[model samples]
Target: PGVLADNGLCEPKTPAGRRLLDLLERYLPALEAESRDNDREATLPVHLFDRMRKEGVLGATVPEDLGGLGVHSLHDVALALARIAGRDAGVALALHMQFSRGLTLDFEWRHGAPSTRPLAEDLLRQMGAGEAVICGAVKDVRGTTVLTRASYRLNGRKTLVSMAGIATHYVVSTRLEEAGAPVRLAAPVVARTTPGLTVLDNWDGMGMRSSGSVDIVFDGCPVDRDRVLPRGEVRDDAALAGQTVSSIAMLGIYVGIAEAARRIALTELRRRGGAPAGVRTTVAEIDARLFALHTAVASALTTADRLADDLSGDLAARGRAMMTPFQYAKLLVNRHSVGVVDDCLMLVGGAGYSNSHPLARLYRDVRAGGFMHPYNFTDGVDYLSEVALGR
Candidate 1:
């Protein structure tokens, strides 16, 4: 209930780091409060945009090269988002999406800086300063690139677009659209506020509702030519094309939610003190499980950290192909977060049993990441299997 001092979010190597952290402390509590209220009402905190914008949290990923404090590690982002989500999941998620989308912009810059020089420059330096919260959407099938051709035109309506309502540039992907037939394509780019673009309302979701990861219709909006950085051939470097930062952010959210759940679990244990042996045993089991989740998170983060070093090229791809440790950690932690939170809430006894309990809210929020996109890592394994068998 008290005001949280700067959350230490922005602490960069320079003065900007100190300023960023200070902003986080001041802004995070309010954002958490907003998420709490929004979860209660199934709506978003309207003022979050203004509040986060003031703090520079919206564009936290923009690099220092471009007047933004550059954050290069998922560990950094994971910690930041966890702290923010500790205050409010929706705020953390929405803001993280801003960073995540911006990361994509950086990806465009990183890959295309040589040929599409001007566009990449603008997307990073100009667009990332929250000049525009450019959000993105992508196709959702296997060989998503190959099966999804540019020729398809992506008619009809597109769903699950985040920040689509407010984004100036909606980075949606289309299959490789290149001339000369043997076309090398690129990621999709959808500009927000363009004609024929429509943001659908009231996405039906139980948690993190404030993010408004709503449906968007491109209709016939023109895709940016420059936005198509890394056209065609998928980055053979799996790490290059893959989205691991999100995994880090999601991991952070999971930890926060689990942490909140752990709080309730302890409180319930104390409240329901000196219960039957069976109940005490349940408490022990829950604690043990919670500890396992913590360990899994730590282990996975360590694994991801190792993988992060291997992100640049052939060696990196081989590293990714060989290491299943990251996926294992995610799978273990996700399951751990879900189960531990559930058991911990139960530990709250009748109090947490109520809809109004804060733990109940955390319960809902933490539970959502267990289902986040990449949506269970079994799919990753399936893809790996294809590689393993040389299919």
Candidate 2:
């Protein structure tokens, strides 16, 4: 446990910081103990979910004023995520979806008007009291899903829903059209037991099998009127920055996965007494990449802290300043984490090829780093081209 937990990736100063760390201390081993078996079965561990609910991690990001022990900073949340991800990326991912969604919902409620915000508040109260499990079901609208009149009757297939099996509430994003012209994005908090909503058991991935990230089929799933939230209009500046916060914090998860890989390589090298100079060189390179990844993530978190009050310049400067670090950190950490995983495989050799080795599982799991939200490598390339080269 110390190999992943005691590294000081993030140390928050608040009382909530130590509380979260202690939660991780008790929770990670349980996930690690069940990781392989869960992966083999491709089963969502209902037991683990219950344990998290009991220990209060399911409400880790509920607003402090909302009767919950809220996270003190983005770094603390990231560290908790990274430590858990180091043990089992799949569960870390599932938990992150819930945490990020909860935070997003709370922000919307805080900034939104009286009519629309109350629904989010209602759900947050339940979450804070440890009576609910929330999950995200956002995906590309794909032109087929629609929100109808009278009620927000959403009908669509949302793929890669991480906690679909165990969620009590879902933050579902889709296109809300008016008069047949596609307006903007709308996210509604829908009930899990809604008659038309279905959680599909069709996840067959090469890695992160324990995530239980399956498809959610919505057949006219209806949410109440006030629960539907529009994107651009509802987000105040602070709430807008929350998006950047969620995007960049995921660096912790990938870092944990990379560190896990690094540990595997180190164990194998020591078991053989010593490694060749080239292998030693690879280890150094892994360290270098990890250094850069962690630094970028740390810088992003610091920038986020300042962004709330650092807007003294032009309007565009404020936007660019708040967004740049998040974009760069995600691209850097993802690329470096994936590279570290590949390099670790080189250090471990054919012994890692067998499914029996945790390194094999790590290899498959780390690849998921490239596919997380905000932007993938290809998206990064296109975005950077637009900004840097006027593409």
Candidate 3:
């Protein structure tokens, strides 16, 4: 078992799952060692991704009929991401986008409109073959799509696009307007080779620097009529459910960070032969917090699993059911993971504070949990409070 696996964070329940985990185990050590260099260079480890793609790790969760591992549940992907994050969060974050998008495409193929199923199937097949890398450009930015005779013209910019230059295609969220009709939110798949599509290498975040999250601009980008996905509105239940499911990967990344921090602290404690009372108590607290974080993550995964096939229920009801647990998990993970890393750093004393220390990287990476969308710290608190108030 890998470092994060022995902790019961990601036990594979199926043979395919087991195989995927084993493949991850093979590359994790290299990922862990290269994390510092990737961070310093602010570039993704493209070769590692290429190797994983070649080994079918990139399509681990696609349906078996689609040439994938057939891992249906997003929970499995979350677990895999957690294990990956323990080694390198930047890589995990980038891979999360790919895995989550693949899951969404799977869902669309199975439950979406009949006309779109073929397209979804094709995209999933491409993913399974590692031929397509689709990045979610769904951030709510100022973007517009004008209807034309043959195709739609997209114009605007999207920030925080992970795998900006590397992704072969981008799933962009844009508002479509037509004569005598209200504007509708639509997602269009824009190919990287499309004219006027510019991927800017301007990402310089304080953490997860090698995630390749940069900005992209669409200047009169042409979108084929067939490529625009039918997203009803901004808050559509199906859309929300997809977002909720994908966002869980961020929680996994933080959980891995906390786990990594704990492992470092334990190694240091053993090296010292004995720990001070404060250090021992801090370790105990970290253990308790880790337990809570694990519970919260499991609860969210359970909720996701339960709602995964309940597609017949009221869409809004299902969305609410799915979102709450994930929101709670996000909240708890954000708060506790940061605290856990901080405590672990304290246990390591001044050595942990040095920039050369892995603890320092873990500390910065864990803080990013509070900033991911769907429920950042402040928004998450408000959403949870609203739920409690029955609003």
Candidate 4:
């Protein structure tokens, strides 16, 4: 809430920056109007996706060399998500799944072993060219993101794939293999056509229904050795308490929903009549929060930007550690943004609650962020406090 909150940091400091804001404003109304049908169907319309792919919107985080805009700044990405969500939260999420992986792929090749380069590149080409997509997978049965092999064969089953019928391949995390032993962690990519991989229509969620989120299975799936990025042992290193994953999922979706709420709220307010007394002040509060939203994201964005400029392994490790904070970022951003949207909805009262209302759908879809990574909520406070308190 520091940087984007009219605190002089995000005050259109540059000409190009102001233009970017203009671009976002012009596109949001159209995007929001278009999102209603897709929101109800719970599945993305192919045409909308095609438009995104063509605009290179889907690969925003990839390096320019890899055919993306290379907008590594979290502010930029968050702005895009807010704009996209202003239209449809579900569509925004589906797009985020791709962009997030694009960010991770860039991180992997840049920091991971040399052997992992092509997988990143493989995904890079597909994403940049708009011909393929890669999504992350997780199976959350008992509020556990601390995954272990249990009894499921690596090739057998994984649940909650963001891409049910929509990816060219998937980036799946499994127990990595070591020189001669099995380890409890690893991240790998599997092509969609791989002999045993199957996508099932098992995901039936309350919102973002169009995302095709479901179960992907591999039947006695024989995994190629290269398919394994054999993880080093994950000893409970006090140092590794943070995170390697980004919190944009929670941060972006909430801001996006808030933006959507505001657009609809203001539209109806205009239709009804001029406000009584404090309409100007009420609008100012939203503007202030809009900046606050930008500032909240800017906190982490600035960190990632600094790291991206000179990515040392230690910096990367520290970035991972900050994930604990990101979890808090996730929980608070979504929780607060939902609150913001809900509050703004009251500006229009009854009209904002109708089935035809924008807030209703935005409210529903924004929740998926919390569920997407259950760990992000409480995980941040606990992990970071341990280190801070030296416990």
Candidate 5:
């Protein structure tokens, strides 16, 4: 089997991307074995995450020069994610936080302040060596950072913190307030053992239960001033570009869910010796939807890559250009992947409806694609409409 032959699901272009897929192929059985257990217990697969780190699978996007695989393309990242998600989307979603953070650090290493490059290099190297797992703590920043004589104190709460308990460090976003100055958004990296950080095991969801997306509280968590990274305002072009990676990677998970369902459907069909005409037609429809989902993801990633590469344009203009394609790709992928999974469930008949069935889990997991941020279905539709109307 060649590298690109992921059952027509994705076409990886780089050596690192292909290599990552190869690694995933070897790890799939273990991932599949752990999938049900993870879902049943609603716990993070810590052992599997450890295996991934040991094998350098967690460093899929880190630069080769920094002791990583150097998979820079968001498309390749999505494809790799899709391959893993085929077995366990919860794991894939959890790992995406690391991948996206690597890419963001890479971006900072290249285009950000020279003063910050050393910190970025250190973190990237740590990630590449599988010595560190960085979690993103930037969601719902209802927190404040106060300037202190020695260091900043972070007092806030963040929801949906992936890899909540297991991560080595967290990149937390908060608003820094200073005397006689306007508040500014700041992101500072804090260690897991920080004096005033707390992780609550409170993530109970309908799907992706093992993703470890829980709530975190910071009560006067001290952040060294040097750990802070320069950031643009929210919704800026750079921020949007950063978000495109995670958005498309999430779409890949749904693609994998759809693929998993189709695999089960095909196996069931074979077990029954054959399918009727109506079943055959449904299979074709599933294939069509999968193809479109793949195409939409590819196009969106390509456009995002182009926009990211062309740094000559106005930031706002580039942001406007980037919004619609990403939203369209996300929307199409969400609807079509869910539709494909539904069709697969129908083809599998009553057996697939059991809670114990893998298809049942896929059904629940695929529905989560739309709920992710940066363009959830509800917001995506309005954003697309506004873009279309030139608002």
Candidate 6:
């Protein structure tokens, strides 16, 4: 019961948190068993999600009233993501996308306009039941994709559609024009099976290879107008509810990845029982840096959770006030995690550079940290500067 709590880290104190703890205890071994295959095949284990469904994680983020586990806090979710990520970052990445979506919808169902409650509940129930897997295909580098034809025809291409191959439903960013200028970006949910929707097998990335991210081209795909939510509205609402921090909680993945590297490095050094002079210094450096990174992530999680509690209660300001801690957390975790993993690689020496070793994979996977943003590392610099300048 007192697991991570002793270390000043988040513990499973709430009902939701406890529920996740049980799931973590049971599911990680199964996940670890396939980690090597997942990395090599670059594919997720579809059946494991079915297990997740049976275990309640598919719907874990949903509110309890909605036939879901009603996870008590974002910290639980983050800790779960981190633990799983320590075993396999790719699966953690894919699962986090789904859980984040469920949490966002659940948050909106509670705080959004009453008129949208029914739709929200329907989504939550379906998601909770494992009857649906929703992928977020909202990142677009080009012009916004338009949802027209009475919101039936969706035509556009979304790059980096994680879990594209297996996602049963897709929440895509869209623009609507009603005989006039375009409006704000709207998010419309679409089924992957809809005609004219194609999942391209083109995701060959440096790491997190099994996340199943690929390009999804929508050539006149069908969508339902009633399902469309305002651009960032779904996300913004969840952020306000404090649930959105789980998205940022993804920092746990890189932190965990580095943690794994540290473990492996320590083991290798211990086996030698006496590395050369400089090697011992490198090992000590890795230990110190990794400790700092771990401290950073834990502190970030605690601060974000505390601030989020305040955020959910104060309904006056928009979500901006609460987002500050999360942004800083992302910056700290992303910046330091890279160095931690790199240091582990240095400590492990030549053996760590091979694909056969987990360190090699972690070295690659941790690179994704800087990119998992509310802002990229470069943009974060600009953001921190602006905030410092009080702009």
Q: Pick the candidate with the highest TM-score.
A: 3
Candidate 3, lDDT over the whole model: 0.80
Residues 1-391 of candidate 5 have per-residue lDDT tens digits of: 1112332336786777788888888789998998998987889999878888999888888999999888887777888888888888988899889888888888778877898888888999999999889998867654443433236777778888877758988888766664455656667888889998889999888889889889888888877878866465345554666667555666778888888888889878878885799998998899888888887777777777677667786766677676668798888987899999999999998988887789999999899888788788788877788777976
In candidate 3, what are the lDDT values of residues 125-206, reduced to their tens digit?
8889988888988665564444332367887788888777578988887777744567667777888999998888898877
205-308 per-residue lDDT for model 6 (tens digits): 89988888888888887676677666442234334434335466677687678677777777777787757998777767766666665566666566656655
Model 6, position 248, has a per-residue lDDT of: 60
Residue 387, model 3: lDDT of 73
Give the Å error, residue 11, model 2. 2.7
lDDT of each: 0.60, 0.76, 0.80, 0.62, 0.80, 0.73
Better of 3 and 4 by TM-score: 3
RMSD of each: 5.1, 3.2, 2.3, 4.7, 2.6, 3.2
Using TM-score as the yardstick, the better of models 4 and 6 is 6
- The lowest-lDDT stretch of 10 consecutive residues in candidate 3 is 1-10
Q: Residue 365, candidate 2: how far off, in angstroms? A: 0.7
lDDT winner between candidates 3 and 6 = 3
Output the lDDT of residue 25, model 2.
86
Model 4, which residues run further than 4 Å from truth?
1-31, 140-153, 176-180, 235-245, 270-290, 313-317
Clashing pairs in 2: none
Tell me model 1's lDDT, rounded to 2 decimals.
0.60
Q: Which stretches of candidate 1 lie over 4 Å from their true place?
A: 1-22, 111-113, 139-156, 176-185, 233-241, 271-276, 302-323, 375-377, 380-391
Better of 3 and 6 by TM-score: 3
Residue 172 local lDDT, model 6: 85
